[PDB]
Enzyme design. Structure first.
Site, PDB file in Angstrom:
ATOM      1  N   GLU D  49       0.869  -1.170   0.000  1.00 40.94           N
ATOM      2  CA  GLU D  49       0.000   0.000   0.000  1.00 40.94           C
ATOM      3  C   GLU D  49       0.911   1.226   0.000  1.00 40.94           C
ATOM      4  O   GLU D  49       1.810   1.334   0.837  1.00 40.94           O
ATOM      5  CB  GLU D  49      -0.953  -0.043   1.195  1.00 40.94           C
ATOM      6  CG  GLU D  49      -2.117   0.941   1.052  1.00 40.94           C
ATOM      7  CD  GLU D  49      -2.887   1.247   2.324  1.00 40.94           C
ATOM      8  OE1 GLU D  49      -2.228   1.342   3.390  1.00 40.94           O
ATOM      9  OE2 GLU D  49      -4.175   1.407   2.253  1.00 40.94           O
ATOM     10  N   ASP D  60      -4.986  10.715   8.444  1.00 38.62           N
ATOM     11  CA  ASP D  60      -3.710  10.133   8.846  1.00 38.62           C
ATOM     12  C   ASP D  60      -3.252  10.632  10.222  1.00 38.62           C
ATOM     13  O   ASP D  60      -3.427  11.801  10.558  1.00 38.62           O
ATOM     14  CB  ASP D  60      -2.663  10.301   7.739  1.00 38.62           C
ATOM     15  CG  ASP D  60      -2.930   9.452   6.497  1.00 38.62           C
ATOM     16  OD1 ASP D  60      -3.220   8.247   6.653  1.00 38.62           O
ATOM     17  OD2 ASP D  60      -2.848   9.998   5.377  1.00 38.62           O
ATOM     18  N   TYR D 175     -10.753  -3.122   3.358  1.00 40.41           N
ATOM     19  CA  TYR D 175      -9.814  -2.591   4.328  1.00 40.41           C
ATOM     20  C   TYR D 175     -10.550  -2.523   5.662  1.00 40.41           C
ATOM     21  O   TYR D 175     -11.411  -1.683   5.840  1.00 40.41           O
ATOM     22  CB  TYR D 175      -9.330  -1.197   3.904  1.00 40.41           C
ATOM     23  CG  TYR D 175      -8.139  -0.666   4.655  1.00 40.41           C
ATOM     24  CD1 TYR D 175      -8.188  -0.460   6.028  1.00 40.41           C
ATOM     25  CD2 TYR D 175      -6.977  -0.327   3.991  1.00 40.41           C
ATOM     26  CE1 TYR D 175      -7.090   0.018   6.722  1.00 40.41           C
ATOM     27  CE2 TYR D 175      -5.870   0.153   4.671  1.00 40.41           C
ATOM     28  CZ  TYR D 175      -5.936   0.338   6.036  1.00 40.41           C
ATOM     29  OH  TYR D 175      -4.848   0.823   6.696  1.00 40.41           O
TER      30      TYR D 175
END
Ligand SMILES: *Cc1c(COP(=O)(O)O)cnc(C)c1O
Ligand SMILES: *Cc1c(COP(=O)(O)O)cnc(C)c1O
Ligand SMILES: [Cl-]
Ligand SMILES: [Cl-]
Ligand SMILES: [Cl-]
Ligand SMILES: [Cl-]
Ligand SMILES: [Cl-]
Ligand SMILES: [Cl-]
Ligand SMILES: [Cl-]
Ligand SMILES: [Cl-]
Ligand SMILES: [Cl-]
Ligand SMILES: [Cl-]
Ligand SMILES: [Cl-]
Ligand SMILES: [Cl-]
Ligand SMILES: [Cs+]
Ligand SMILES: [Cs+]
Ligand SMILES: [Cs+]
Ligand SMILES: [Cs+]
Ligand SMILES: [Cs+]
Ligand SMILES: [Cs+]
Ligand SMILES: [Cs+]
Ligand SMILES: [Cs+]
Ligand SMILES: [Cs+]
Lengths: 395, 253, 395, 253
Positions: D49, D60, D175
């Site tokens: 990834e 993030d 995911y």
């Protein structure tokens, strides 16, 4: 001869050089006429509403009074255009100047709030404004001086005597004695010679009038006490006037105790000074034993007037109003309390009134009492002062 | 005492006006002030007007503000001024001595006690700069009880009511700030007028007397000479002597 | 699925990580419910009136327009508690947080005005407030940081990315994604993901509602145009909303032109940027050619948002509202003009709106036009900035 | 291509989970990033990834924020990232390569053109971090038109409607940020789940597979090793090799 009584009991008068009496008589005449003139009143009401933003809010402070039998409301003069109650009376005096055909304004200022108030009123009404300010005050009040000049006022630094408020007070009178045919002297508090204590009260009395209406609507009765800080006396007399004849309503004025009455470093002449004659009036003064006028002291520059309006002296002598003091540290605590618990930053002047209301509540938490504090101004101006102290104490 | 009455009668006999200098007591210091005052007298001052240093002199211009600051810088108090006044009277028994006061210093320890102290040291008159005639009653009454003349200002903006009041209430002399006024004051039997506006040269002294005034008061010009010669006390006295001599000469028939 | 359309035409949306969708759906649900709940509305009206001081004045500016056929009124959001219009919507969002059972507030701030607005609302309503602020912004906004802490808010300096508003915007979302069961994210403008542009508009719409009522009462008709400065879009959409369906009323939004559009140093993405997807929305953005988000530039830190609310983008695309820019120097002139001629110190943000109204008047002085400028805040905060420039120019 | 499908079939045959490291392209610089990635592969990464540096990485945490800052400090652009991707695919023909993108960089020059570029360089999947399934339609459509798997996040707060949507719309893999979820995804024939929450040690890799996931994604731990060894590129590579080897070992039957 005058149209109105220049004294409140023994206090007040017109103690000015002879040359200034016609100017005072003229002003008194113009004011008496104005007060009878619906057109003057409509114009004043228009300015207060559409320019200054009256009526001002009456805020309940439940967070502060939780767990006690005190109900506390703040009369929000801090929300008025310019951020203090001074605006009400400068708009009235500016209209009086116009009524007398004057095109210029003279003003004195200490901390600068009155200078700014005078300058904004002058700018709105197209009057040419010049403001006397003690050189020491000029030096320490850079923000206010700049606001005055932005608004088109001429700011004149006074270098005479101590070069503070009392000296600015003097130099304004000097100018006026020569210029009164064209210039109006816009006095900043409910003090000085008649007719100023009377005019200033009447041009501030909507504070108390609105408070009474608002408390009747919200609570269905009159307040047990109204509480205001006392520099020269305008915000306080403005809150008190409409309540004087309601003899169940306590009237509590709060003078600055500074570092503590016993230190002599305070601004509480009404209770801890001595009657004298100065600034055109017979009233309690900060003065030496041989009769020289002293500077007061307060954390709050706006309560640093070394005397007090004569109507306050009168109301105290007859026992209609009670006067107390609040020290620098008490006012600072009240400042912190209001910021944290209500999200309102009060003027350090107004924080003295709040501090005394907080004392009334805390000392006797099961006493049922409905209190209004006059929140005379907001305290953005004071954040550097507060910051500096807190740091110095290690807070 | 009748010092003003006697002075005016004597001057009248000589077809002469009065010349009256003003100084601040204790400016620039006690000993120098004393020499200044004796210099004014020896040069021909007919009477004195003397200020007591006060924190807030509301009726006074820049020259006088600065005189006050000098006298305070020197530590001069009202008590010391009254000590000076007693000394001055002891040196000079006939010259009229008038004070220019602020209301607070008169009221401070009681109005009656103030004028009692004035009488004790031999003062003849008191002008209270911030008391208009309308408020003067307790000051005038205390003054007269202690054989002190209350002095009033007749300003340029005076009306007829004011003229009548000033005429009736004042003694010693009427303090004029200006010819109609002069004629009206006499008509109303006022104390003799001394012109106190703008008297800074001999021609103004002569003009005052020619206009019908009994004389002229130099409100600041004497103080200007003090301020100019601070660094040189000897020259200061010299210049005061020649100025006062010239001013008094201007009053003479 | 949502209850309301998340788009204004092509603009808007909910472009957030999946983890945040339940928080947005929850908020939308709570808002839709609140808007139907008379008790919620009564509580909000109570705060706006008795705490913030609504209604705000509508001031006529005859001194400024003398000799022209322009009539100019200022809607006086500068008189609201806290000194800007931000206060209206933070009080609404705080009540929504309470409705959802939340006890904590998270806020982002650039210049600090939203941080202070969030902190005061939190203090009043007893919510625990934490505010994210770019370290660079913290450094340059000492007064606002101190006000936040006085009001009991925790101020968290962000050191990530550029360490400015967009980065504060990011770190607030990070916290919320973990804390949304107990914390409400109080977004500071009419932008970001749905439902925020909708909520913020509706919690600001009293600006325009009051303006319409006030202008009808004073002038007997609708304004020819209402004019507001555009940072993220809240004050403007607040003034515009109630006028959208009055198609004779021009809606003019003013973006900061900074040093001039041609220099690239501005904050005018709606007219001079490029649509992108960021901060949770599809809207015009300041961005590089390869799609990195840029900082805007304005003399006025409060107009330094690098995007714009999606409803403004929509209104422009359909031609219902027109958007223009005003440069630093134009805004500075308008600032000076208002201080000198009306005695009101405007926020430099609001001075952009005034500058464009002054242009409308001056360019065409014999055009009859009734204009309202939204005076979004007062400019005490800006006096050091203005002082510094004037000195540097030698003024 | 069918790189994910092939990988999962091969792993299944070996009763093995996938181990998938994340790094930021260009962190700490282009040449070093290339060596990092080849090191991850040679140590046994089953897929990659890869993040493209973006001004505002909303989804993030701190480790990744810092990776972004490093890559920008090095002047890394999206164009350079795509150059890197082409080189990586040319070196390694079967390993699935997934991107983690922000919506603005996908939308910037046209969504279709973005995914066309992905196909040209040999990318297999794209996760757009700030596009929820509800807004994904134009991204999914462009992806599939260009033989790119659109990857969706199944968060801990997922409900049944979300599970069904993720199952229906995603390809390549799902995911997972977390066992109920794993069972439901399989029930709805979702792309094989990779666990992406908190995978920082071998035991978590084994736990993921034991729970029924097809493998595990190490979202930040690889970047932590980069950040720790910035001053020592040789040691950096050494530590990445041993970490990845250990993590992959944990996946093995
Ligand atoms: C000027 C001022 C005062 C004190 O003056 P008053 O005449 O006694 O009212 C008090 N509070 C504020 C906020 C002021 O600006
Ligand atoms: C915050 C602020 C603005 C800009 O934000 P908007 O959301 O566009 O209204 C403008 N003026 C003032 C005074 C502000 O405080
Ligand atoms: Cl009396
Ligand atoms: Cl003017
Ligand atoms: Cl005049
Ligand atoms: Cl009572
Ligand atoms: Cl001496
Ligand atoms: Cl003698
Ligand atoms: Cl759409
Ligand atoms: Cl709290
Ligand atoms: Cl949570
Ligand atoms: Cl129109
Ligand atoms: Cl490198
Ligand atoms: Cl391979
Ligand atoms: Cs209570
Ligand atoms: Cs005082
Ligand atoms: Cs006394
Ligand atoms: Cs002569
Ligand atoms: Cs109001
Ligand atoms: Cs006009
Ligand atoms: Cs903007
Ligand atoms: Cs595009
Ligand atoms: Cs294992």
């Amino acid at each position: 001869t005058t149209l109105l009584n220049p004294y409140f009991g023994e206090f007040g008068g017109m103690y000015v050089p002879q040359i200034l009496m016609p100017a005072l008589n003229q002003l008194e005449e113009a004011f008496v006429s104005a007060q009878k003139d619906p057109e003057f009143q409509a114009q004043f009401a228009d300015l207060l509403k559409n320019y200054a933003g009256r009526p001002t809010a009456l805020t309940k402070c439940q967070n502060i009074t939780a767990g006690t039998r005190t109900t506390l409301y703040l009369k929000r003069e801090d929300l008025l255009h310019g951020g203090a109650h001074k605006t009400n009376q400068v708009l009235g005096q500016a209209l009086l100047a116009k009524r007398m055909g004057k095109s210029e304004i003279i003003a004195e200022t200490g901390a600068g709030q009155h200078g700014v108030a005078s300058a904004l009123a002058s700018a709105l009404l197209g009057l040419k404004c010049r403001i006397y300010m003690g050189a020491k005050d000029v030096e320490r009040q850079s923000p206010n001086v700049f606001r005055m000049r932005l608004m088109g006022a001429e700011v004149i630094p006074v270098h005479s005597g101590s070069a503070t408020l009392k000296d600015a007070c003097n130099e304004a009178l000097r100018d006026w004695s020569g210029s009164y045919e064209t210039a109006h002297y816009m006095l900043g508090t409910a003090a000085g010679p008649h007719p100023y204590p009377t005019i200033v009260r009447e041009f501030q009395r909507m504070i108390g009038e609105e408070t009474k209406a608002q408390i009747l609507d919200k609570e269905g009765r009159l307040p047990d006490a109204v509480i205001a800080c006392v520099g020269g006396g305008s915000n306080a007399i403005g809150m008190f006037a409409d309540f004087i004849n309601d003899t169940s309503v306590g009237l509590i004025g709060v003078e600055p105790g500074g570092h503590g009455i016993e230190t002599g470093e305070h601004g509480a002449p009404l209770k801890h000074g001595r009657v004298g004659i100065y600034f055109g009036m017979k009233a309690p003064m900060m003065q030496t034993a041989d009769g020289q006028i002293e500077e007061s002291y307060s954390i709050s520059a706006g309560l640093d007037f070394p005397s007090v309006g004569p109507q306050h002296a009168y109301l105290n002598s007859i026992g209609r109003a009670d006067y107390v003091s609040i020290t620098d540290d008490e006012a600072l605590e009240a400042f912190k309390t209001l910021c944290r618990h209500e999200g309102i930053i009060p003027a350090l002047e107004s924080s003295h009134a709040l501090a005394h209301a907080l004392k009334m509540m805390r000392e006797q938490p099961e006493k049922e009492q409905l209190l209004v504090v006059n929140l005379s101004g907001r305290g953005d101006k004071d954040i550097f002062t507060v910051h500096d102290i807190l740091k110095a104490r290690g807070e | 005492m009748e010092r003003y009455e006697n002075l005016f009668a004597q001057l009248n006999d000589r077809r002469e006006g009065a010349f009256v200098p003003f100084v601040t007591l204790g400016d620039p210091g006690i000993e120098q002030s004393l020499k200044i005052i004796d210099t004014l007298i020896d040069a021909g001052a007919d009477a004195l007007e003397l200020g007591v240093p006060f924190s807030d002199p509301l009726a006074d211009g820049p020259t006088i503000q600065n005189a006050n600051l000098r006298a305070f810088a020197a530590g001069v108090t009202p008590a010391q001024c009254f000590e000076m006044l007693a000394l001055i009277r002891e040196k000079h028994p006939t010259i009229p001595i008038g004070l220019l006061m602020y209301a607070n210093l008169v009221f401070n320890n009681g109005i009656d006690a103030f004028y009692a102290r004035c009488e004790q040291v031999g003062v003849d008159s008191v002008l209270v700069a911030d008391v208009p005639v309308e408020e003067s009653a307790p000051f005038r009454q205390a003054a007269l009880r202690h054989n002190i003349a209350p002095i009033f200002i007749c300003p340029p903006n005076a009306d007829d009511d004011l003229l009548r009041q000033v005429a009736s209430y004042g003694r010693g002399y009427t303090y004029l700030l200006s010819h109609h006024l002069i004629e009206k004051l006499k008509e109303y039997h006022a104390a003799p007028a001394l012109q106190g506006f703008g008297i800074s040269s001999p021609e103004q002294v002569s003009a005052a007397v020619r206009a019908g005034a009994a004389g002229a008061i130099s409100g600041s010009a004497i103080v200007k000479i003090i301020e100019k010669n601070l660094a040189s006390p000897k020259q200061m006295l010299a210049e005061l002597r020649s100025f006062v001599s010239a001013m008094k000469a201007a009053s003479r028939a």
